[PDB]
Design a protein around this ligand. Sequence first.
Ligand SMILES: O=C(CCCCCCCNc1nc2cc(C(=O)O)ccc2c2cnccc12)NO
Ligand SMILES: [Cl-]
Ligand SMILES: [Cl-]
Length: 330
Amino acid sequence: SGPVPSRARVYTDVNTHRPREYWDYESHVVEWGNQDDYQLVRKLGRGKYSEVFEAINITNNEKVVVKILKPVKKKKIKREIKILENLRGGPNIITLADIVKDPVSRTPALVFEHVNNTDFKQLYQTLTDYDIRFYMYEILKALDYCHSMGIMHRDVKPHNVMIDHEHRKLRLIDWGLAEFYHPGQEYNVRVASRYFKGPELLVDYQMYDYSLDMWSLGCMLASMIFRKEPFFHGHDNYDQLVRIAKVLGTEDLYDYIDKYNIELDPRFNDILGRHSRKRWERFVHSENQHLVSPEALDFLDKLLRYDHQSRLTAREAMEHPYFYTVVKDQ
Ligand SMILES: O=C(CCCCCCCNc1nc2cc(C(=O)O)ccc2c2cnccc12)NO
Ligand SMILES: [Cl-]
Ligand SMILES: [Cl-]
């Protein structure tokens, strides 16, 4: 026997109902724009497999951002392009304005809308309770939208949320790890950064779905309301699950593993041992108490569940009382 199958609880068949050109990114033909329209102004970042510049569109003198794509797996170029084009115009999704060939190496470069960003290591220190709720709701809007469009982001983390706090404007960026959800498909578990990897990634359960993004979101929320960054501070991939188990407890972990017939490494199983669940109240202290409320902890608790089928969907999350007043704000 093998692992038990799983299906997305919501939006399960969205891609099946669309024409195949929507999700068959390998068959996408790229419409290339005019590289001469853009001139690089300065370097903004040099992440993995990509370089990011501030640039100028000289046909309208619009400040834009150019990301030069250099993945090892070339199939991710069309993938990112197709996903950006399918989600274009959606709430809080970064806008792909153009695609051009870098005149140096003929490598693809994406042109994006420019956002007036403020770094999170400078921002999450000054956020009020209300601000945390408001921006979580904006992220949820983006996630419900991309999930409803058949797409899982798979790399939700602070650096991939651009915030113009002066205008209370938020954009979800870097769709280079995003994939289309197809029921029954097995996905790669190497996605996401360690601190934000869901337990399904950490136990090598490959038939995961949109709910992966809901675990990541939970990890961000916990780090903001408790002012512990990252909240689960694993030092390698096994330690990440150990740190999770020390908070959520091993009883629900072992029930999760049994439910889906997941094959755990025996020495790892021995290492996890037995840990009781810690009540969320243990993480409150005088320095973070102004960010904690009963509805915050209930919401957090309903995002950070081992069983991916048990986590709140983005829409259920948007209906949680934690956002009640925020919902009346717009
Ligand atoms: O949490 C945070 C963390 C701040 C991290 C700073 C990263 C600097 C890179 N800077 C931009 N990287 C982009 C990447 C993409 C993409 O890969 O899709 C799309 C758009 C941008 C972008 C747009 N406008 C201004 C700057 C950038 N801040 O709130
Ligand atoms: Cl406790
Ligand atoms: Cl969802």
